[PDB]
Design an enzyme around this catalytic site. Structure first.
Site, PDB file in Angstrom:
ATOM      1  N   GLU A  99       0.812  -1.211   0.000  1.00 41.66           N
ATOM      2  CA  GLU A  99       0.000   0.000   0.000  1.00 41.66           C
ATOM      3  C   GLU A  99       0.848   1.265   0.000  1.00 41.66           C
ATOM      4  O   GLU A  99       0.435   2.279  -0.572  1.00 41.66           O
ATOM      5  CB  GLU A  99      -0.949  -0.002   1.199  1.00 41.66           C
ATOM      6  N   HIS A 134     -16.765  -8.423 -10.548  1.00 38.90           N
ATOM      7  CA  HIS A 134     -16.411  -7.425 -11.554  1.00 38.90           C
ATOM      8  C   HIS A 134     -17.411  -7.407 -12.704  1.00 38.90           C
ATOM      9  O   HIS A 134     -17.780  -6.333 -13.193  1.00 38.90           O
ATOM     10  CB  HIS A 134     -14.998  -7.685 -12.071  1.00 38.90           C
TER      11      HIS A 134
HETATM   12  C1  LIG Z   1     -14.092   9.420 -15.100  1.00 35.50           C
HETATM   13  O1  LIG Z   1     -15.161   8.897 -14.414  1.00 35.50           O
HETATM   14  C2  LIG Z   1     -14.825   7.651 -13.782  1.00 35.50           C
HETATM   15  C3  LIG Z   1     -16.064   7.193 -13.043  1.00 35.50           C
HETATM   16  O2  LIG Z   1     -17.126   6.927 -13.949  1.00 35.50           O
HETATM   17  C4  LIG Z   1     -13.574   7.742 -12.880  1.00 35.50           C
HETATM   18  O3  LIG Z   1     -13.023   6.429 -12.845  1.00 35.50           O
HETATM   19  C5  LIG Z   1     -12.682   5.927 -11.537  1.00 35.50           C
HETATM   20  O4  LIG Z   1     -11.283   6.052 -11.210  1.00 35.50           O
HETATM   21  C6  LIG Z   1     -10.934   5.521  -9.920  1.00 35.50           C
HETATM   22  C7  LIG Z   1      -9.459   5.784  -9.722  1.00 35.50           C
HETATM   23  O5  LIG Z   1      -8.669   4.713 -10.219  1.00 35.50           O
HETATM   24  C8  LIG Z   1     -11.289   4.036  -9.837  1.00 35.50           C
HETATM   25  O6  LIG Z   1     -11.038   3.584  -8.510  1.00 35.50           O
HETATM   26  C9  LIG Z   1     -10.505   2.240  -8.484  1.00 35.50           C
HETATM   27  O7  LIG Z   1     -11.543   1.305  -8.196  1.00 35.50           O
HETATM   28  C10 LIG Z   1     -11.114  -0.064  -8.077  1.00 35.50           C
HETATM   29  C11 LIG Z   1     -12.350  -0.932  -7.918  1.00 35.50           C
HETATM   30  O8  LIG Z   1     -12.278  -1.583  -6.657  1.00 35.50           O
HETATM   31  C12 LIG Z   1     -13.616  -1.817  -6.172  1.00 35.50           C
HETATM   32  O9  LIG Z   1     -13.624  -2.925  -5.295  1.00 35.50           O
HETATM   33  C13 LIG Z   1     -12.808  -2.767  -4.118  1.00 35.50           C
HETATM   34  C14 LIG Z   1     -12.825  -4.084  -3.368  1.00 35.50           C
HETATM   35  O10 LIG Z   1     -12.076  -5.031  -4.122  1.00 35.50           O
HETATM   36  C15 LIG Z   1     -13.361  -1.595  -3.297  1.00 35.50           C
HETATM   37  O11 LIG Z   1     -12.564  -1.412  -2.137  1.00 35.50           O
HETATM   38  C16 LIG Z   1     -13.345  -0.318  -4.151  1.00 35.50           C
HETATM   39  O12 LIG Z   1     -13.868   0.776  -3.405  1.00 35.50           O
HETATM   40  C17 LIG Z   1     -14.100  -0.522  -5.467  1.00 35.50           C
HETATM   41  O13 LIG Z   1     -15.480  -0.608  -5.111  1.00 35.50           O
HETATM   42  C18 LIG Z   1     -10.167  -0.159  -6.882  1.00 35.50           C
HETATM   43  O14 LIG Z   1      -9.762  -1.510  -6.695  1.00 35.50           O
HETATM   44  C19 LIG Z   1      -8.948   0.730  -7.136  1.00 35.50           C
HETATM   45  O15 LIG Z   1      -8.061   0.656  -6.025  1.00 35.50           O
HETATM   46  C20 LIG Z   1      -6.775   0.195  -6.491  1.00 35.50           C
HETATM   47  O16 LIG Z   1      -5.758   1.124  -6.140  1.00 35.50           O
HETATM   48  C21 LIG Z   1      -5.511   1.274  -4.727  1.00 35.50           C
HETATM   49  C22 LIG Z   1      -4.462   2.355  -4.559  1.00 35.50           C
HETATM   50  O17 LIG Z   1      -5.082   3.615  -4.793  1.00 35.50           O
HETATM   51  C23 LIG Z   1      -5.069  -0.078  -4.169  1.00 35.50           C
HETATM   52  O18 LIG Z   1      -4.789   0.048  -2.785  1.00 35.50           O
HETATM   53  C24 LIG Z   1      -6.193  -1.094  -4.389  1.00 35.50           C
HETATM   54  O19 LIG Z   1      -5.834  -2.353  -3.830  1.00 35.50           O
HETATM   55  C25 LIG Z   1      -6.528  -1.210  -5.873  1.00 35.50           C
HETATM   56  O20 LIG Z   1      -5.400  -1.843  -6.469  1.00 35.50           O
HETATM   57  C26 LIG Z   1      -9.361   2.180  -7.430  1.00 35.50           C
HETATM   58  O21 LIG Z   1      -9.784   2.736  -6.196  1.00 35.50           O
HETATM   59  C27 LIG Z   1     -12.756   3.824 -10.192  1.00 35.50           C
HETATM   60  O22 LIG Z   1     -13.068   2.436 -10.242  1.00 35.50           O
HETATM   61  C28 LIG Z   1     -13.074   4.456 -11.542  1.00 35.50           C
HETATM   62  N1  LIG Z   1     -14.482   4.291 -11.865  1.00 35.50           N
HETATM   63  C29 LIG Z   1     -14.928   3.395 -12.751  1.00 35.50           C
HETATM   64  C30 LIG Z   1     -16.412   3.361 -12.957  1.00 35.50           C
HETATM   65  O23 LIG Z   1     -14.169   2.648 -13.361  1.00 35.50           O
HETATM   66  C31 LIG Z   1     -12.476   8.665 -13.409  1.00 35.50           C
HETATM   67  O24 LIG Z   1     -11.649   9.091 -12.333  1.00 35.50           O
HETATM   68  C32 LIG Z   1     -13.055   9.878 -14.121  1.00 35.50           C
HETATM   69  N2  LIG Z   1     -12.005  10.634 -14.786  1.00 35.50           N
HETATM   70  C33 LIG Z   1     -11.449  11.737 -14.269  1.00 35.50           C
HETATM   71  C34 LIG Z   1     -11.960  12.171 -12.924  1.00 35.50           C
HETATM   72  O25 LIG Z   1     -10.571  12.351 -14.853  1.00 35.50           O
END
Ligand SMILES: *[C@@H]1O[C@H](CO)[C@@H](O[C@@H]2O[C@H](CO)[C@@H](O[C@@H]3O[C@H](CO[C@H]4O[C@H](CO)[C@@H](O)[C@H](O)[C@@H]4O)[C@@H](O)[C@H](O[C@H]4O[C@H](CO)[C@@H](O)[C@H](O)[C@@H]4O)[C@@H]3O)[C@H](O)[C@H]2NC(C)=O)[C@H](O)[C@H]1NC(C)=O
Ligand SMILES: *[C@@H]1O[C@H](CO)[C@@H](O[C@@H]2O[C@H](CO)[C@@H](O[C@@H]3O[C@H](CO)[C@@H](O)[C@H](O)[C@@H]3O)[C@H](O)[C@H]2NC(C)=O)[C@H](O)[C@H]1NC(C)=O
Ligand SMILES: *[C@@H]1O[C@H](CO)[C@@H](O[C@@H]2O[C@H](CO)[C@@H](O)[C@H](O)[C@H]2NC(C)=O)[C@H](O)[C@H]1NC(C)=O
Ligand SMILES: *[C@@H]1O[C@H](CO)[C@@H](O)[C@H](O)[C@H]1NC(C)=O
Ligand SMILES: *[C@@H]1O[C@H](CO)[C@@H](O)[C@H](O)[C@H]1NC(C)=O
Ligand SMILES: *[C@@H]1O[C@H](CO)[C@@H](O)[C@H](O)[C@H]1NC(C)=O
EC number: 3.4.17.23
Lengths: 49, 596
Positions: free
Chosen positions: B357, B487
């Protein structure tokens, strides 16, 4: 945040008018290519150094 | 004046406003994740609504700047992100219907529950009981029944929703200029406008299949060895030449094979590398572990953490009335605020997770200087890969000896390395054929080649073909087996895991070579060398400004993914597996069916 030109040393400016960026006149209203020049900070205790 | 100058001013106003609004929304998410209360749920909703609404008008107003008048190659990227990240083309009824379908899918997955046969008395949930049964229970009937029962009660209800869901996503994609939703997902890796580094959406399908062709020999030998060990456990059920039953993979869906390490141990007589007792004897707590993790980062030259992280981040379970989600997360609230949320116990896994992390936190600060729309990794795979390579070097015996948890008297021989290699192979190598297949199947259905009445016939045909796993109970079209996955039911792209695995081994070889390391790759430590940290930091600070093809060449000197580093890492295991497969046939038979 926006100004037509730079500032001479030891000068101040309090004029608050719509900074025109587009070709068409702003006519004293905001919106498309018509932005207010003054922008406010944001201060909270959790902000980083 | 000109389009570029007019567009430049617009981004400046958007850059400052976005940071303030994003900070308030992220803090609300952090507040609820630590203090689970109904008002904090509302605070998340109120903060989320404003952030979502703000991205709507900005994207709509950004449509008045045509993209063909900008040649800076940086303003174009920022404008492009806004026009696609919140813009809506579907009608009001379709937008409401699509959101209702997605909300229904997420809720039913969480609320989906199955329980004991022919008894409505007591019932349980997936995470508490089903996972434990699949992970540990060795009963053939209990494993087989649970595998069938959950799929029947979850997939069948979600089958009609998926058919309606694929319709709207294709309509939205076809409303846009993309061919379909499958092409919509593949557009992340596309790189355009740069000579000698261009990437096309259609090229990804060719490269992914090409890499999987070179990894086939490694997987089948592991499959042959795993099948042989399963014979000693379940003699009658498993055939020497057929596919393994789908309910005997140690988990619910067979994504990982780590649960089979005890059954398939190469040499169980040898001691295992465990420091849980050593940490207890030395009286390690949550703060000491994280300080040790931070120290490893300093030794390579990267800056270490600020005072804001230490004061704000919680690293222990509060307990009592205060209930929080204990899943580790790396929070980047922006504006110089970085926090980590994880419940920590005194185990090696938490010691390794602390390094995992912290790697994401270091990547976040590297591109802090970039504009708001460029504060992200080059693609969906780089961010995950960075957080994994640090765990690779944190588990080496050399690192443990230097810290002092491992006794200096410990020795290394044939079996200590082989046992360690097999533990890693069961987790990394096993999931790759599963990962490649699942993303592939979603591509054809979104493309439309596979009709609805043949979704399951095509689904299980490839399971016996690529993965070499046969279903234990036949399923008709009523079920929706893919929807049973988290997923798939939540509409998340799944190819990011296939590319991440290849990327991490390319990075490790580049860093080990730069640190002038010699010997086997799996015994590599980069703690002391400051040259590896400097080279890595160059890529991290770039952000999204440069194309990912150029960024990779600055690290490994290549413009594309490669599989050769992965094979070299597992090379010592490859030769031994060939020795153990002398009398065992290699390859599964698609004709066999467990249910006669
Ligand atoms: C455009 O709009 C979209 C939304 O429509 C935005 O996209 C999002 O971006 C974020 C940033 O990456 C994404 O967040 C990621 O989600 C992953 C999904 O995990 C799910 O399941 C876990 C449990 O397994 C939950 O805890 C979690 O809350 C989710 O529900 C996460 O796994 C990712 O975390 C990863 O990175 C961290 C480090 O930061 C690690 O510690 C983790 O282990 C993991 O590897 C991450 O948080 C999000 O999913 C995106 N949305 C979609 C729909 O895809 C864009 O940001 C936006 N564009 C912009 C703003 O420019
Ligand atoms: C595309 O547009 C961006 C944004 O305008 C350009 O980045 C700008 O680059 C110039 C120099 O390359 C920067 O000027 C520098 O300003 C700092 C103070 O911030 C000053 O100390 C330096 O001496 C120098 O004058 C400018 O700040 C920077 N803009 C931003 C917002 O960071 C970029 O150059 C453009 N691309 C091309 C190919 O021209
Ligand atoms: C990097 O250097 C540090 C200090 O120069 C090493 O730390 C020592 O490691 C030895 C083991 O070889 C221990 O006996 C010492 O007690 C350690 N001292 C301190 C102050 O930490 C560290 O081991 C080196 N890195 C690696 C991977 O060996
Ligand atoms: C959690 O929320 C409650 C109710 O709003 C509040 O009283 C409390 O101070 C918050 N924080 C903690 C740590 O309980
Ligand atoms: C790392 O953090 C410590 C505080 O624990 C500090 O003394 C040290 O100077 C930091 N290292 C760097 C390179 O800033
Ligand atoms: C074990 O290591 C020795 C090294 O002396 C080698 O001769 C032998 O072939 C190895 N055996 C296996 C099974 O790897």
């Amino acid at each position: 945040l926006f100004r037509k030109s730079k500032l001479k040393p030891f000068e101040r400016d309090i004029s608050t008018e719509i900074y025109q960026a587009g070709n068409k006149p702003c006519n004293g209203v905001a919106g498309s290519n018509c932005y207010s020049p003054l922008q406010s900070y944001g201060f909270r205790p959790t902000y980083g150094v | 004046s000109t389009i570029e100058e007019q567009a430049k001013t617009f981004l400046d106003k958007f850059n400052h406003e976005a940071e303030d609004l994003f900070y308030q929304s992220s803090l609300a998410s952090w507040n609820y994740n630590t203090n689970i209360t109904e008002e904090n749920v509302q605070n998340m909703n109120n903060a989320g609504d404003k952030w979502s609404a703000f991205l709507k008008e900005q994207s709509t107003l950004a449509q008045m700047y045509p993209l063909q008048e900008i040649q800076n190659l940086t303003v174009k990227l920022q404008l492009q992100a806004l026009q696609q990240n919140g813009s809506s083309v579907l009608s009001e009824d379709k937008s409401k219907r699509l959101n209702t379908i997605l909300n229904t899918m997420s809720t039913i997955y969480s609320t989906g529950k199955v329980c004991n046969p022919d008894n409505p008395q007591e019932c349980l949930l997936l995470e508490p009981g089903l996972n434990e049964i699949m992970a540990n229970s060795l009963d053939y009937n209990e494993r087989l029944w649970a595998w069938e029962s959950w799929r029947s009660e979850v997939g069948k209800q979600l089958r009609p929703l998926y058919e309606e869901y694929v319709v709207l996503k294709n309509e939205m994609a076809r409303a846009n200029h993309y061919e379909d939703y499958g092409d919509y997902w593949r557009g992340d890796y596309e790189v355009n406008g740069v000579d000698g580094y261009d990437y096309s959406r259609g090229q990804l399908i060719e490269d992914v299949e090409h890499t999987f062709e070179e990894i086939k020999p490694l997987y089948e030998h592991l499959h042959a060895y795993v099948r042989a060990k399963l014979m000693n456990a379940y003699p009658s059920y498993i055939s020497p030449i057929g596919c393994l039953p789908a309910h005997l993979l140690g988990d619910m869906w067979g994504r990982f094979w780590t649960n089979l390490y005890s059954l398939t141990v190469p040499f169980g007589q040898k001691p295992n590398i465990d420091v849980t007792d050593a940490m207890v004897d030395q009286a390690w707590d949550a703060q000491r572990i994280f300080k040790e993790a931070e120290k490893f980062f300093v030794s390579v030259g990267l800056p270490n953490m600020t005072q804001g992280f230490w004061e704000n981040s919680m690293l222990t379970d509060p307990g009592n009335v205060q209930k929080a989600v204990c899943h580790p997360t790396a929070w980047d609230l922006g504006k110089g605020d970085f926090r980590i949320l994880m419940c920590t116990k005194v185990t090696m896994d938490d010691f390794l997770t602390a390094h995992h992390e912290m790697g994401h936190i270091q990547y976040d600060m590297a591109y802090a200087a970039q504009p708001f729309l460029l504060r992200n990794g080059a693609n969906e795979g780089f961010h995950e890969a960075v957080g994994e390579i640090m765990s690779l070097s944190a588990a080496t015996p050399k690192h443990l000896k230097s810290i002092g948890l491992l006794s200096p008297d410990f020795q290394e021989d044939n079996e200590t390395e082989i046992n360690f290699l097999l533990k890693q192979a069961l987790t990394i190598v096993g999931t790759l054929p599963f990962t490649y297949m699942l993303e592939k199947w979603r591509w054809m259905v979104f493309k439309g080649e596979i009709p609805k009445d043949q979704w399951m016939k095509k689904w299980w045909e490839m399971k016996r073909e690529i993965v070499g796993v046969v279903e234990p109970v036949p399923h008709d079209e009523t079920y929706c087996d893919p929807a049973s996955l988290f997923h798939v039911s939540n509409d998340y792209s799944f190819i990011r895991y296939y590319t991440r695995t290849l990327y991490q081994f390319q990075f490790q070889e580049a860093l080990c070579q730069a640190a002038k390391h010699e010997g086997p790759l799996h015994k590599c430590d980069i703690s002391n060398s400051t040259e590896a940290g400097q080279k890595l930091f160059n890529m991290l600070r770039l952000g999204k400004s440069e194309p990912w093809t150029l960024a990779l060449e600055n690290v490994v000197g290549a413009k594309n993914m490669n599989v050769r580093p992965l094979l070299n890492y597992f090379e010592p295991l490859f030769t031994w597996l060939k020795d153990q497969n002398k009398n065992s046939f290699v390859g599964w038979s698609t004709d066999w069916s467990p249910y006669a």
